[PDB]
């Protein structure tokens, strides 16, 4: 078997291997990828997303999200509060403002300790999910906007013909800025692009371990899981690398820098933070090995997770027995 202890693998194809983005996807779990739950991938030294990043601050972030924790140091949970309207300009110029920017620290293992003991105590506000693409239309290698959609490969997998779209977001993110432990909406891959500006700093358990990390969660979030047997498709509930370990939780962790792309396998349980002003570009994504995953994931039903609308078909082709329990907690 490779990759036996689930080690997080960098890539660094050809421009000749990057031509054709499944072959890659399958090259990589050829040589073990998956069983960490996340990879790297450099891109050629001859790529580029697009020419320049110049004229990107007129974009809007229609719904700033401030990101406000709970709980203690290594083990909180966190709700957003919806600020005002701002451009991309507007909200590089507040994610540099004294309030909010990145700490003087000596290397990337320093600022992530200082993430990890001062995170709870600041709310940084977060540009997240917003619908759009970075990648011009003539990039025409791991364009995320032109990727297979995961409507044709369930249909060219199991023959079913459903509606929904599959398209980018893009995350504008500032110091502290946090991403929860979660997996996938049913499972899926995610690709995610680092545009530009400062690092994002990732935590994966590795698939075959996501329910030790379920269970240390129902442990610590007691009241949470008591409310839904799914609660971490709430995508709230952070948990330190210190706690991880001292809990025997299987994990890595690897920093992700700009022109970097990073994918996330099935039922890779991921979490994380940004080190500073960035911007970041990221889209899931289906592949015939994703079909029993897809089929086993999980599911909130409670009502706090709401999702897209293209989930519907997913949940009613694959799962069928929960469909009607699930679309109430949609309705
Ligand atoms: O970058 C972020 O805030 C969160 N991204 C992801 O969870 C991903 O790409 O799967
Ligand atoms: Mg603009
Ligand atoms: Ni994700
Ligand atoms: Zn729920």
Wanted: net charge neutral; hydrophobic share 35%.
């Amino acid at each position: 078997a490779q990759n036996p202890n689930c080690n997080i693998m960098i890539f660094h194809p050809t421009k000749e291997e990057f031509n054709d983005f499944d072959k890659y996807i399958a090259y990589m779990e050829s040589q073990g990828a998956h069983r960490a739950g996340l990879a790297k991938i450099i891109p050629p030294k001859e790529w580029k997303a697009r020419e320049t990043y110049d004229n990107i601050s007129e974009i809007l972030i229609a719904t700033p999200l401030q990101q406000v924790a709970s709980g203690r140091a290594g083990v909180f949970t966190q709700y957003h509060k919806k600020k005002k309207a701002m451009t991309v300009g507007e909200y590089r110029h507040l994610a540099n403002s004294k309030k909010y920017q990145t700490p003087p620290h000596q290397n990337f293992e320093d600022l992530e300790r200082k993430y990890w003991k001062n995170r709870i105590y600041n709310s940084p506000i977060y540009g997240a999910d917003i619908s759009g693409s970075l990648f011009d239309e003539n990039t025409k290698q791991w364009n995320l906007g032109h990727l297979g959609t995961i409507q044709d490969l369930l249909e060219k997998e199991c023959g079913v013909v459903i509606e929904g779209v599959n398209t980018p977001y893009l995350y504008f993110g500032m110091w502290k800025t946090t991403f929860a432990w979660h997996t996938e909406d049913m499972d899926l891959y995610s690709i995610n692009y680092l545009h530009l500006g400062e690092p994002k700093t990732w935590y994966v358990v590795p698939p075959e371990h996501g329910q030790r990390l379920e269970r240390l969660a129902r442990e610590l979030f007691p009241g949470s899981s008591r409310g839904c047997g799914a609660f971490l498709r709430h995508k709230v509930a952070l948990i330190s690398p210190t706690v991880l370990k001292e809990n025997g939780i299987p994990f890595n962790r690897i920093t992700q820098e700009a022109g970097e792309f990073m994918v996330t396998f099935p039922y890779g349980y991921h979490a994380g933070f940004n080190h500073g002003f960035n911007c970041a570009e990221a889209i899931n994504f289906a592949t015939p090995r994703w079909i029993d995953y897809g089929k086993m994931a999980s599911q909130c039903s409670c009502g706090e997770a709401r999702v897209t609308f293209s989930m519907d078909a997913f949940v009613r082709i694959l799962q069928p027995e929960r469909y009607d329990l699930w679309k109430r907690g949609q309705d």
